[PDB]
Amino acid sequence: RTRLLDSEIKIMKSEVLRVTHELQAMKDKIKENSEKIKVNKTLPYLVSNV
Amino acid sequence: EAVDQNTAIVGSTTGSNYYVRILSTIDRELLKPNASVALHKHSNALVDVLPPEA
Amino acid sequence: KLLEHKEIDGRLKELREQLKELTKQYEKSENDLKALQSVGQIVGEVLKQLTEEKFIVKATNGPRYVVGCRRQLDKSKLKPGTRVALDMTTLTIMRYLPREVDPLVYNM
Amino acid sequence: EKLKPGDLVGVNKDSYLILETLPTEYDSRVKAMEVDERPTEQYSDIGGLDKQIQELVEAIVLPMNHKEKFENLGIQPPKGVLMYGPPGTGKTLLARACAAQTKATFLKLAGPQLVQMFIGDGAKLVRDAFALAKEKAPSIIFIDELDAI
Amino acid sequence: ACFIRVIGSELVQKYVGEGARMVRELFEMARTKKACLIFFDEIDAIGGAR
Amino acid sequence: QTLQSEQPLQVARCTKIINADSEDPKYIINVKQFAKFVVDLSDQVAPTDI
Amino acid sequence: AVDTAEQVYISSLALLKMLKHGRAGVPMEVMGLMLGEFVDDYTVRVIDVFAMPQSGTGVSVEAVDPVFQAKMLDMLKQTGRPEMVVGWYHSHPGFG
Ligand SMILES: Nc1ncnc2c1ncn2[C@@H]1O[C@H](COP(=O)(O)OP(=O)(O)OP(O)(O)=S)[C@@H](O)[C@H]1O
Ligand SMILES: [Zn+2]
Fold first, then answer.
1. Any idea what DSSP says for residue E17?
2. Which residue minimizes the CA distance to atom 11 of ligand 1?
3. Among candidates F18, D4, D122, B16, which has minimal Cα distance to B39?
4. Are F28 and A46 inside 8 Å of each other by CB?
5. Where are the coiled-coil regions (chain F)?
6. Per-position DSSP letters for D88-142, written without gaps between them
7. How far apart are CA D98 and CA D61, in angstroms?
8. Which residues of G are less than 8 Å from D14 in CB distance?
9. Distance (Å, rounded) from C-alpha C99 to C-alpha D6?
10. N- to C-terminal Cα distance for chain A?
11. What SS3 state is found at G36?
12. Is D18 helix (H, G, I), strand (E, B) or coil?
């Protein structure tokens, strides 16, 4: 009756990790792809040779 | 061409021809028909003689 | 009877694996955002060794320059005939490369 | 893996950063040379080129229908069939008879259309042609005036 | 009808792959309309010698 | 006295269009010589015939 | 109103941040801000010049995120002493 409540509070302990890691995914991804939209609105995309 | 002392008329490897002056440093018998020449960018003036192809 | 510890361990597995993998692709794509520091170079070929620290490079559309190394780019490696990567602002040599030209030598 | 020697990639001005390999860039001239018109020149309409019709059909259309018949014997079909001769015997007619009496994705290709001014298009165009005819795997591929390229 | 003189050296322009486009301009004018009349003259200027 | 009224006009360039993406313009374009230009459309266009 | 010769006293940190921020701003013409004090019409001392993040679209005022300012200067609120943003800077790092 004590370890199950410990796992219940550890579910929220992992949900805070879910919140912060989904933040490090999503809020950082908004940074990355807002910068990449800033690279995706240009004059050309200059053709070239690799 | 040099119209007088240290005022050149210089062709480039961008193709066109310019009209600048050269320094007080370079000896006047290094450009005697020509040279592979060293030019600045903003000042765009004659600096040095490159070693010829030989 | 205590399968809520495995409903918490399964929440750990699923939610942490998904958020960690999303933030791992976000780590490598934050590194792709960090590539907005690695912003472009030029490439030319060493035409000669001017001085021990100077080289004449070949802009492939045009003109020829005077460059140096970064600091320790092995000035014996940069023989006339190698291809280098050139800086964008300073225009000097950044990184050596291989390659060479027309495949009529290669296809035979 | 999208990169290789010889890639048109679309690059930013100010960053000079690669963003696309030009993935979906099939032009109007690229898609116009593809054949959806399907001509109808009959074999009986052509006369006298008997053994050349034999070589033509029996060495191109039989790979279209019988690869295993080459595999049951242990041989290999030729790659490359060339027509040449005087400019009145009917050369384009045989490619049109192919387009009529076979249905395995006839592909014309005109010669000086491959002569480009926007430089780098014709090689991409030939690779597009073989990729497109690869999408419809039996590939009837014809080019007239190969000397012009 | 629509009658068109053709100077042969209206195809002979300087730069690479342009008289080809001049033939393109010809066929663009041609397939706009009906019963039109292209008149060549002096096709040695265009040429028949390989 | 009509000069300065026309001075806020724009030197905007004619082009030639390479392709159309699906569901959006996302148009790729070349003018003559520079590069192959990735563009938008303005809002007051007829988005059919671009 | 009336006009009298305006004077820009510079913080030397501003000189350092301009040279460094445009040095890192390699050709791509970065944007940053100026953060200073309203003394009068005819003088200005700038006391702080900090950095603004690189935007690859076009050097604009619409790249100036005001909540970036709010958060950065919020960290700078108890840190030393904040003041008014009194301007901005762009770069042409090769030519004059
Ligand atoms: N067996 C045939 N039966 C009927 N007409 C034929 C036959 N062979 C040739 N022709 C005619 O000859 C012309 C076809 O030859 P071409 O169109 O010249 O083929 P081709 O590819 O153009 O040859 P070249 O070298 O490219 S000019 C048409 O006028 C046909 O009617
Ligand atoms: Zn500037």
1. T
2. D90
3. B16
4. no
5. none
6. TS-SHHHHHHHHHH--S-EE---SGGG--SSTTHHHHHHHHHHHHHHHSSS-EE-
7. 9
8. 27-28, 56
9. 13
10. 64
11. strand
12. strand
The H helix count followed by the E strand count for chain C is 3, 5
Which amino acid type is present at position B26? I
Which DSSP string do the residues of A1-48 spell out, in sequence order? --HHHHHHHHHHHHHHHHHHHHHHHHHHHHHHHHHHHHSSS-S--B--
Residue type, G64: V
The secondary structure of residue C67, as a DSSP letter, is B
Concatenated DSSP letters for B1-54?
A: -BSSTT-EEEE-TTS-EEEE-B-SSS-TTSSSS---EEE-SSS--EEEEPPP--
In whole angstroms, give the CA distance from residue G57 to residue A43.
Answer: 9
Enumerate long-range contacts of D63-68, CB under 8 Å, 24 or more apart: D64/D102, D64/D104, D64/D138, D64/D140
Contact assessment for residue C97 and residue C68, using Cβ atoms and an 8 Å cutoff: no
DSSP, res G85: E
Tokens of B51: 């070693």
Task: Give the integer Cα–Cα distance in Å for D77 and D96.
Answer: 22
CA–CA distance, A48 with C44 (Å, rounded to integer): 15
What chains are in contact with F, requiring at least 3 Cβ pairs below 8 Å?
A, D
The whole-angstrom distance between residue E37's C-alpha and the CA centroid of its chain comes to 12
Pocket perturbation via mutation, ligand 1, pick of D56, D89, D108 by most ligand atoms within 8 A of CB: D89
Residue D142 CA to chain centroid, in angstroms?
5
Taking residue C33's Cβ as centre, other Cβ atoms within 10 Å add up to: 18
Q: The tokens 């027309």 sit on which residue?
A: C102
Q: Is F38 on the interface with D (CB under 8 A)?
A: yes
Residue type, B41: K
The Cβ of residue F18 has, within 10 Å, a number of other Cβ atoms equal to 19
Tell me the technique behind this structure.
cryo-EM
Going from the C-alpha of C16 to that of each of A30, C2, C13, D148, the distances in angstroms are 20, 21, 6, 63
Q: Rounded to an integer, what distance in angstroms lies between the CA atom of residue D78 and that of residue D55?
A: 12
Tokens standing for D10?
């679309």
β pairing state of E3-7 and E37-41:
parallel
- Residue G92 is labelled as binding a ligand: yes
Chains C and E touch each other (3 or more Cβ pairs < 8 A): no
Q: How far apart are CA G88 and CA G84, in angstroms?
A: 12
Q: Give C87's DSSP letter.
A: P
CB C70 within 8 A of CB C90: no
Residues of D in contact with A37 (CB under 8 A): none
One-letter amino acid of D11: V
Question: Which of G19, G21, G23, G26 to mutate: most C Cβ within 10 Å?
Answer: G26
- What is the C-alpha to C-alpha distance for residues G48 and G73, in angstroms, rounded to an integer? 11
Inter-CA distances, G2 with D132, E5, G6, G86, G91, Å:
75, 74, 12, 20, 31
